[PDB]
Amino acid sequence: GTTRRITMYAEKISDELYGYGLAPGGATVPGPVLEMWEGDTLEIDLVNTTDRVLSLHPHGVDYDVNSDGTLMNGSAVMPGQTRRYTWRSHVGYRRADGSWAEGTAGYWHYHDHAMGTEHGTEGVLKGLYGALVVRRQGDLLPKRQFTVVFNDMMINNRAHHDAPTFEANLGERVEWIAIGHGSNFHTFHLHGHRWLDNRTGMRTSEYDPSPLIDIKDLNPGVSFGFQVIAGEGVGPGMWMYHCHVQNHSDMGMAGMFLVRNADGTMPAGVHEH
Amino acid sequence: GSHMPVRAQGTTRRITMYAEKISDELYGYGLAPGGATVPGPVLEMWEGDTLEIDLVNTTDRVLSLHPHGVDYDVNSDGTLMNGSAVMPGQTRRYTWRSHVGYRRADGSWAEGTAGYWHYHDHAMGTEHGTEGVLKGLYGALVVRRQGDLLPKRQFTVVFNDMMINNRAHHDAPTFEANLGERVEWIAIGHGSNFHTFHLHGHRWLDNRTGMRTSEYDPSPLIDIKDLNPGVSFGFQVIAGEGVGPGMWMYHCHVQNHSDMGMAGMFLVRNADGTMPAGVHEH
Amino acid sequence: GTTRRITMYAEKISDELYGYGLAPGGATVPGPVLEMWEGDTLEIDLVNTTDRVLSLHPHGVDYDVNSDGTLMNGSAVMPGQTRRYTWRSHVGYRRADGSWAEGTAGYWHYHDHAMGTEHGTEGVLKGLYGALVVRRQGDLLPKRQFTVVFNDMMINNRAHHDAPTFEANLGERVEWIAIGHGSNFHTFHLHGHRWLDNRTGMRTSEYDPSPLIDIKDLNPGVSFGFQVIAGEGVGPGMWMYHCHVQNHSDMGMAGMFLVRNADGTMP
Numbered sequence: 162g163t164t165r166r167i168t169m170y171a172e173k174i175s176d177e178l179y180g181y182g183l184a185p186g187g188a189t190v191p192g193p194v195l196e197m198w199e200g201d202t203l204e205i206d207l208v209n210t211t212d213r214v215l216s217l218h219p220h221g222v223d224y225d226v227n228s229d230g231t232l233m234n235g236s237a238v239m240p241g242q243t244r245r246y247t248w249r250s251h252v253g254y255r256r257a258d259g260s261w262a263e264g265t266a267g268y269w270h271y272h273d274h275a276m277g278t279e280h281g282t283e284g285v286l287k288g289l290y291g292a293l294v295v296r297r298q299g300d301l302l303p304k305r306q307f308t309v310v311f312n313d314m315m316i317n318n319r320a321h322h323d324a325p326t327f328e329a330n331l332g333e334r335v336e337w338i339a340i341g342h343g344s345n346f347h348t349f350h351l352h353g354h355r356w357l358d359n360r361t362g363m364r365t366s367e368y369d370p371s372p373l374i375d376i377k378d379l380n381p382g383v384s385f386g387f388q389v390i391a392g393e394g395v396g397p398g399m400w401m402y403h404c405h406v407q408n409h410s411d412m413g414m415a416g417m418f419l420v421r422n423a424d425g426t427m428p429a430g431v432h433e434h
Numbered sequence: 435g436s437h438m439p440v441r442a443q444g445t446t447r448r449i450t451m452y453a454e455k456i457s458d459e460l461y462g463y464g465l466a467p468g469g470a471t472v473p474g475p476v477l478e479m480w481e482g483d484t485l486e487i488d489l490v491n492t493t494d495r496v497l498s499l500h501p502h503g504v505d506y507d508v509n510s511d512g513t514l515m516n517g518s519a520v521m522p523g524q525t526r527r528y529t530w531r532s533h534v535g536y537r538r539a540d541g542s543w544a545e546g547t548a549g550y551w552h553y554h555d556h557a558m559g560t561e562h563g564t565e566g567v568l569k570g571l572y573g574a575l576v577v578r579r580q581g582d583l584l585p586k587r588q589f590t591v592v593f594n595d596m597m598i599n600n601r602a603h604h605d606a607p608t609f610e611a612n613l614g615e616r617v618e619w620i621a622i623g624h625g626s627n628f629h630t631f632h633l634h635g636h637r638w639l640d641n642r643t644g645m646r647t648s649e650y651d652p653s654p655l656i657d658i659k660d661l662n663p664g665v666s667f668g669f670q671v672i673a674g675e676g677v678g679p680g681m682w683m684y685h686c687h688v689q690n691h692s693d694m695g696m697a698g699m700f701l702v703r704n705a706d707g708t709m710p711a712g713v714h715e716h
Numbered sequence: 717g718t719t720r721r722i723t724m725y726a727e728k729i730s731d732e733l734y735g736y737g738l739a740p741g742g743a744t745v746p747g748p749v750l751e752m753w754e755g756d757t758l759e760i761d762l763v764n765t766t767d768r769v770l771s772l773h774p775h776g777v778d779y780d781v782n783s784d785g786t787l788m789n790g791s792a793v794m795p796g797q798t799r800r801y802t803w804r805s806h807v808g809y810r811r812a813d814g815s816w817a818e819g820t821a822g823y824w825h826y827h828d829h830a831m832g833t834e835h836g837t838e839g840v841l842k843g844l845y846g847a848l849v850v851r852r853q854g855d856l857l858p859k860r861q862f863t864v865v866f867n868d869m870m871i872n873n874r875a876h877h878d879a880p881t882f883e884a885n886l887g888e889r890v891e892w893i894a895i896g897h898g899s900n901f902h903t904f905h906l907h908g909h910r911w912l913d914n915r916t917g918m919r920t921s922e923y924d925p926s927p928l929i930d931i932k933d934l935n936p937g938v939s940f941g942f943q944v945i946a947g948e949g950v951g952p953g954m955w956m957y958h959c960h961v962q963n964h965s966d967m968g969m970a971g972m973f974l975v976r977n978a979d980g981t982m983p
C-alpha cells in the first residue's frame with residue numbers, strides 16, 4: 162500500500178450550508194470523493210475555517226480513537242484550528258485462529274461527528290458528508306462517478322426541487338455511490354437500470370447468490386455503491402432516480418440520470434440552452 | 435423445422451390490461467373488462483421473453499403502468515414526463531423485454547433479468563403515481579430463470595401504507611395451502627410507511643429464490659424482512675415443513691402496525707386438504 | 717441431537733419492566749441467551765409469575781402451532797400457570813424434489829406474544845425478549861457475548877440516557893446479537909469495527925460476495941449477529957455504538973463498547 166497526504170478545508174458556504182473541500186474556497190456538498198486501494202494510508206489535515214466546532218469521521222477504514230472525530234475522544238477541531246486525521250486500510254489476511262480478517266474494500270463515507278451534538282447532527286444536516294471509496298485490487302473503474310446523498314428530505318442538500326442531474330453517455334461505465342443521512346427513512350430507486358446486491362454490484366463468480374435489484378433501503382448512516390452500463394438494453398433519455406417513498410418523491414426527492422447518445426449528443430425530448 | 439432459429443430466442447406474449455375504477459376508494463388492473471383486482475394479475479415471464487401490453491384506461495383519470503427490473507425504453511417507462519402515461523379512455527401500448535445473462539465485450543457479466551419484480555401506476559395524482567398506488571394499481575411481475583422450481587400455490591402480499599392488499603375492513607387476506615405444498619410468496623411494499631414482513635413457523639434463505647443455490651451460498655436464513663416502499667422480493671417454502679398444519683400468522687412486525695390490523699393468516703390444511711383443529715369450512 | 721429442558725420465569729422486575737429468567741427472582745432484560753446446535757431440541761417450562769397474561773414466542777426454530785405462544789392458537793399463559801413450549805431444530809437435508817432444506821442456524825430471538833395485545837406489544841415494550849442463538853457445527857465461539865436490542869427509543873430498556881456499556885479486552889473474540897423491536901426504525905452502527913454482511917459476519921470461501929459493513933438496519937422483529945476481534949487494527953478505547961438516526965442518537969440511543977488494554981486496564 163501507499164501513503165497519501167491531503168489537506169481538507171471545512172467552510173461555511175452559506176447560512177444553511179457547511180462543506181469540505183480540497184482547496185481554499187472549493188468546498189462542495191457533497192464533499193470530494195476520497196479513494197484508497199486496500200492497505201493504503203490516507204492522512205488528512207482538516208482545516209476548520211469556521212466559527213463552529215466540527216470534525217471528520219469515516220466508516221469502514223481503520224482508525225484509532227484519536228482519529229474518531231468525536232469530542233468524547235478529544236478528536237474534534239476547534240474553530241480556526243487544524244487537526245491531523247489518519248485513516249488506514251488493509252488487504253484480507255489469515256488470523257492465527259484460522260479465520261479470515263476481511264480487507265477494507267467497500268463503498269464508505271465520511272462526515273462530521275462534532276457539530277451541534279456529540280453525533281454531528283447539525284454538521285450532517287448542513288452538508289459535511291462525502292464518499293469514501295476503498296478499492297480492492299482488480300476492481301473495475303468507472304468513466305463517471307456520482308454521489309447521491311439522501312439527507313433528511315434533501316438530495317445532496319439541494320433546494321425545493323433542484324435535484325442533481327447526473328449525466329453519462331450511452332454505454333459508459335457509471336459508478337453510483339449512495340449514502341443516507343438524517344432522521345428519515347428512504348428507498349433509493351433508479352429507472353431503467355439495475356445491479357446485483359453485493360459489494361461491487363456485479364457478478365463475482367458462478368456461485369454468487371446475490372439477487373438482482375433496482376431499489377435498496379438507504380437509511381441514515383448507510384452507504385452502498387454499484388456500477389451500471391448507461392442505457393444498457395434500455396437506450397438513452399431522461400432516466401428518473403428517486404426515493405420510492407411516495408410522499409418523499411412528491412416533496413421532490415427525485416432527479417434525473419441523463420443518458421445521452423454514445424457520441425454525447427442530447428436525446429429526443431431534451432431542450433438545450 | 436430446419437431451419438430453426440440461428441440463435442435461441444425467448445417468447446413474445448401479448449396481453450391487454452384494463453385499468454378500472456372499482457369503487458370510490460379502489461382502482462385496479464385486470465385482464466378482462468370488469469375483471470380488475472387489487473392486487474392485479476401476476477405477470478410471469480422467462481428470461482429472454484418479451485411482454486407487449488396494451489393498457490386500456492377505462493377511467494376518467496390519467497394513469498399509467500410502469501415496471502421494475504425488466505428492460506423498457508423511455509417510451510415505455512409509464513411517466514407523463516416521458517410522454518409515457520395514458521389519457522382518460524385511451525389505449526397505450528407498452529413493451530417490456532428481458533434477457534438471459536451475457537458476457538460483455540469488456541469481460542464483465544450482465545446479469546439476467548430474473549427475480550421477483552412488480553408493476554404499478556406512475557401517473558395518477560402525481561408524477562409518481564401516489565394516488566394510483568394508494569388506490570390499488572399495482573401488481574407482481576415474476577421473471578424466472580431456467581431451472582427455477584415452480585410453485586403449487588402463489589401469494590401476492592402488498593404492504594401499502596397501513597393496508598395489506600388494500601384490505602381496509604379487518605379482512606386482511608387468508609392465504610391457503612395444503613401441508614407439503616410448494617408455496618410462493620411475493621412481497622411488495624408501497625406508500626409512505628416502513629414495514630417488516632414476518633411469517634410464523636416458516637423461513638427462507640435471503641437471496642433471489644429463498645433457497646440454497648450451491649454449497650458456497652453465505653445468505654443467512656430468515657423469517658423476517660424489511661418491506662419498504664418500492665421494494666419487492668419473493669421466496670418459496672414447503673407449507674408446514676417440520677412445523678405442521680394450522681393457522682400460521684403472517685404480519686408486519688412493527689408493533690403499532692400489527693395492532694392496527696396488518697396481519698393475516700397463512701392457513702396450512704392437512705395434506706389431503708382437510709381443516710386442522712380450530713378451523714371450520716363452509 | 718441433544719434435548720435440553722429448562723424452566724423460564726416471567727417476572728415483573730419493576731413497574732416499567734417485565735423479564736424472563738432462568739431462576740426465581742433472576743429475570744433480566746434482555747432475557748437469557750438461549751443456545752442450540754442444529755438438531756437439538758429445547759423444551760421450556762414457562763412459569764408465569766405475574767398478574768398479566770403473557771407468552772413465549774421464538775423466531776427461526778421449528779415449533780408446532782401449540783407452541784407458537786399466541787392467544788389465537790391457545791398457546792399463551794394465564795397468571796399463575798405454567799406452560800410447556802417445545803423448540804426443535806434441524807441440520808440441512810436434501811428434499812425429494814432435489815432442493816435443499818436449510819438447517820436452522822442463525823441469530824434468532826424470542827419474545828412475548830400475548831401481553832397487552834395479540835402481538836405482545838406491551839410485553840415487548842416492557843422488556844420480554846432475548847436472543848436465541850442456533851449454531852452450525854464448526855462455528856467459532858466467542859469469548860464475550862453482547863445482546864443489543866433497539867426497543868423503540870430504548871437500548872435494552874435503558875430509558876435514562878443510560879445505554880449499556882459492553883466490555884472486552886483488546887484482542888478478544890466478541891459476539892454481538894442485535895435485535896429490533898417496537899414501532900420505530902433504527903440503524904445499528906459500531907465505531908472502529910466491521911463485519912461481513914452474512915450469517916456469521918465472516919468469510920467462508922473466496923466466493924462469498926457479501927459486502928463488508930459497519931452499520932445495518934435493525935427494525936422491529938429483525939435480528940442478526942456477527943463476531944469481531946476487539947480493537948483489531950484500531951487499538952483499545954471508548955468505541956461508540958449507536959443508532960445512526962440522528963434524532964435518535966441525540967435522544968440517547970448511544971452507548972460504549974469499551975475495549976480495555978490486553979491486560980484489563982482502562983485506556
Ligand SMILES: COc1ccc([C@@H](O)[C@H](CO)Oc2ccccc2OC)cc1OC
Nearest residue numbers: 689690691693694695832833837838839841
Ligand atoms: C387492537 O387494539 C389495540 C391495542 C393497542 C393499540 C395501541 O395503543 C398500541 C399498539 O400500537 O398498544 C399498546 C399497548 C400496550 C403498550 C403500548 C402500546 O402502544 C404504545 C392499538 C390497538 O388497535 C389499533
Ligand SMILES: [Cu+2]
Nearest residue numbers: 274907956958
Ligand atoms: Cu458515530
Ligand SMILES: [Cu+2]
Nearest residue numbers: 347404406409
Ligand atoms: Cu425518502
Ligand SMILES: [Cu+2]
Nearest residue numbers: 352500501502
Ligand atoms: Cu420504477
Ligand SMILES: [Cu+2]
Nearest residue numbers: 220272382960
Ligand atoms: Cu456515520
Ligand SMILES: [Cu+2]
Nearest residue numbers: 431432433434
Ligand atoms: Cu429555450
Ligand SMILES: [Cu+2]
Nearest residue numbers: 352401403556
Ligand atoms: Cu419511479
Ligand SMILES: [Cu+2]
Nearest residue numbers: 459601602603
Ligand atoms: Cu372501505
Ligand SMILES: [Cu+2]
Nearest residue numbers: 629686688691
Ligand atoms: Cu408495517
Ligand SMILES: [Cu+2]
Nearest residue numbers: 632634774775
Ligand atoms: Cu414470529
Ligand SMILES: [Cu+2]
Nearest residue numbers: 405502554664
Ligand atoms: Cu416502483
Ligand SMILES: [Cu+2]
Nearest residue numbers: 713714715716
Ligand atoms: Cu350456507
Ligand SMILES: [Cu+2]
Nearest residue numbers: 634683685829
Ligand atoms: Cu407474530
Ligand SMILES: [Cu+2]
Nearest residue numbers: 732874875876
Ligand atoms: Cu424510567
Ligand SMILES: [Cu+2]
Nearest residue numbers: 902959961964
Ligand atoms: Cu434509531
Ligand SMILES: [Cu+2]
Nearest residue numbers: 218219220907
Ligand atoms: Cu461511525
